[PDB]
From Swiss-Prot:
The keyword RNA-binding does not apply. The keyword Cell cycle does not apply. Its main location: secreted. This is Basic phospholipase A2 KPA2.
Amino acid sequence: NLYQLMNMIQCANTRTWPSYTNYGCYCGKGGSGTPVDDLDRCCYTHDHCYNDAKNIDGCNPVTKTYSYTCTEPTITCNDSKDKCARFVCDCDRTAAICFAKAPYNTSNVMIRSTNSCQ
Ligand SMILES: CCCCCCC(=O)O
Ligand code: NA
């Protein structure tokens, strides 16, 4: 779920939401070019995770609601029986964690369509 994903990001980092809404070549809707740094690489993978998720019947990562738990900054996926809920939760979980780990370069904030993401 796009909103739950927001919270995993909230639950695992210091950096706010708009902080990722549009950063580098892949953080944000769709992606082009080659990832910029490793934070953008987090977004690249997330993306791909979402594409694979779509390979599950009736599975829309973007709107699927799963069961997860947060205890700043640890987050857990409680889905077992719903294959889509779990695949998507791990997708989002892995991203949040990936984000908290990566450095935040302020010069990559809006290089979109600017030519490096061909
Ligand atoms: C385009 C609005 C979406 C969220 C992008 C979150 C991210 O960097 O994966
Ligand atoms: Na993207």
